[PDB]
Amino acid sequence: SLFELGKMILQETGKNPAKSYGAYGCNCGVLGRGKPKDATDRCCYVHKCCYKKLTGCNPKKDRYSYSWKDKTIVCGENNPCLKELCECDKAVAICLRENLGTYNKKYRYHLKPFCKKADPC
Protein backbone atom coordinates (compact mmCIF):
# COMPACT_ATOMS: atom_id res chain seq x y z
CA SER A 1 0.00 0.00 0.00
CA LEU A 2 0.98 3.67 -0.11
CA PHE A 3 1.97 3.41 3.56
CA GLU A 4 4.74 0.91 2.82
CA LEU A 5 5.77 2.67 -0.41
CA GLY A 6 5.97 6.04 1.33
CA LYS A 7 8.07 4.61 4.15
CA MET A 8 10.47 2.95 1.68
CA ILE A 9 10.94 6.23 -0.19
CA LEU A 10 11.63 8.02 3.09
CA GLN A 11 14.11 5.37 4.23
CA GLU A 12 16.03 5.39 0.92
CA THR A 13 15.85 9.06 -0.12
CA GLY A 14 15.46 10.84 3.21
CA LYS A 15 12.77 12.99 1.62
CA ASN A 16 9.14 13.56 2.44
CA PRO A 17 7.63 11.28 -0.24
CA ALA A 18 4.45 13.36 -0.63
CA LYS A 19 6.36 16.64 -1.06
CA SER A 20 9.03 15.29 -3.40
CA TYR A 21 7.20 12.59 -5.35
CA GLY A 22 3.44 13.06 -4.88
CA ALA A 23 3.33 15.22 -8.03
CA TYR A 24 6.56 15.22 -10.05
CA GLY A 25 6.93 15.24 -13.82
CA CYS A 26 4.63 13.09 -15.92
CA ASN A 27 4.75 9.85 -13.91
CA CYS A 28 5.30 10.46 -10.16
CA GLY A 29 1.87 10.70 -8.56
CA VAL A 30 -1.73 10.30 -9.63
CA LEU A 31 -3.27 8.87 -12.80
CA GLY A 32 -1.30 7.31 -15.59
CA ARG A 33 2.02 7.56 -17.37
CA GLY A 34 3.51 10.10 -19.73
CA LYS A 35 6.78 10.52 -21.56
CA PRO A 36 9.28 10.96 -18.69
CA LYS A 37 10.89 14.36 -18.15
CA ASP A 38 14.10 13.13 -16.42
CA ALA A 39 15.56 10.13 -14.60
CA THR A 40 13.51 10.65 -11.42
CA ASP A 41 10.32 10.76 -13.50
CA ARG A 42 11.43 7.65 -15.37
CA CYS A 43 11.71 5.79 -12.05
CA CYS A 44 7.98 6.39 -11.51
CA TYR A 45 7.27 5.35 -15.11
CA VAL A 46 8.90 1.95 -14.54
CA HIS A 47 7.05 1.72 -11.21
CA LYS A 48 3.69 2.17 -12.95
CA CYS A 49 4.58 -0.44 -15.56
CA CYS A 50 5.54 -2.67 -12.62
CA TYR A 51 2.08 -2.23 -11.07
CA LYS A 52 0.38 -3.23 -14.33
CA LYS A 53 1.99 -6.68 -14.19
CA LEU A 54 0.35 -7.39 -10.82
CA THR A 55 -2.56 -9.83 -10.77
CA GLY A 56 -4.58 -10.67 -7.68
CA CYS A 57 -3.79 -7.75 -5.38
CA ASN A 58 -4.45 -4.02 -5.18
CA PRO A 59 -1.19 -2.01 -5.12
CA LYS A 60 -2.84 1.04 -3.53
CA LYS A 61 -4.58 -0.58 -0.54
CA ASP A 62 -3.03 -4.03 0.04
CA ARG A 63 -0.57 -4.06 2.93
CA TYR A 64 2.58 -6.16 3.08
CA SER A 65 5.46 -6.74 5.47
CA TYR A 66 9.02 -5.58 4.91
CA SER A 67 11.96 -4.82 7.18
CA TRP A 68 14.91 -2.44 7.19
CA LYS A 69 17.99 -4.63 7.68
CA ASP A 70 21.57 -3.44 7.12
CA LYS A 71 20.05 -0.26 5.63
CA THR A 72 18.34 -2.40 2.99
CA ILE A 73 14.67 -2.92 2.18
CA VAL A 74 13.97 -6.62 2.74
CA CYS A 75 10.56 -7.79 1.56
CA GLY A 76 8.96 -10.25 3.94
CA GLU A 77 6.29 -12.02 1.91
CA ASN A 78 5.77 -15.43 0.34
CA ASN A 79 2.55 -14.54 -1.51
CA PRO A 80 3.54 -13.97 -5.18
CA CYS A 81 1.47 -10.80 -5.69
CA LEU A 82 2.46 -9.20 -2.37
CA LYS A 83 6.09 -10.20 -2.99
CA GLU A 84 6.09 -8.67 -6.49
CA LEU A 85 4.28 -5.57 -5.23
CA CYS A 86 6.87 -5.12 -2.48
CA GLU A 87 9.73 -5.48 -4.98
CA CYS A 88 8.06 -2.91 -7.26
CA ASP A 89 7.95 -0.43 -4.37
CA LYS A 90 11.50 -1.25 -3.23
CA ALA A 91 12.81 -0.73 -6.77
CA VAL A 92 11.29 2.72 -7.19
CA ALA A 93 12.57 3.82 -3.77
CA ILE A 94 16.10 2.75 -4.76
CA CYS A 95 15.75 4.31 -8.23
CA LEU A 96 14.60 7.64 -6.77
CA ARG A 97 17.56 7.64 -4.38
CA GLU A 98 20.05 6.88 -7.17
CA ASN A 99 18.75 9.80 -9.26
CA LEU A 100 18.40 12.39 -6.48
CA GLY A 101 21.32 14.26 -8.05
CA THR A 102 19.21 15.40 -11.01
CA TYR A 103 15.98 16.06 -9.08
CA ASN A 104 14.63 19.42 -10.30
CA LYS A 105 11.93 21.19 -8.31
CA LYS A 106 10.70 22.82 -11.52
CA TYR A 107 9.03 19.48 -12.36
CA ARG A 108 6.99 19.54 -9.14
CA TYR A 109 3.26 20.01 -9.81
CA HIS A 110 3.78 19.42 -13.53
CA LEU A 111 0.46 19.58 -15.39
CA LYS A 112 -0.90 16.65 -17.41
CA PRO A 113 -1.78 18.49 -20.63
CA PHE A 114 1.96 19.25 -20.92
CA CYS A 115 2.90 15.54 -21.04
CA LYS A 116 3.22 13.55 -24.24
CA LYS A 117 1.65 10.12 -24.66
CA ALA A 118 3.66 7.39 -22.96
CA ASP A 119 4.82 4.32 -24.83
CA PRO A 120 3.23 0.95 -24.04
CA CYS A 121 4.93 -0.75 -21.11
- Which active-site residues does the annotation give? 47, 89
- Binding a copy of itself (rule: CB under 8 A), the pick from 8, 12, 27, 29 is 29
- Residues near ligand GKP (CB under 6 A) are 3, 6-7, 10, 17, 111-113
Scored b (16 or more CB within 10 A) or e, 68-80 reads eeeeebebeeeee
3-state DSSP assignment of residue 24: strand
What CA–CA distance (Å, rounded) separates 118 from 23? 17
Residue 52 is given by DSSP the state: H
- Binding a copy of itself (rule: CB under 8 A), the pick from 14, 16, 102, 116 is 16
Residues that bind a copy of itself (CB under 8 A): 1-3, 6, 16, 18-19, 22-23, 29-31, 60-61, 108-109, 111-112
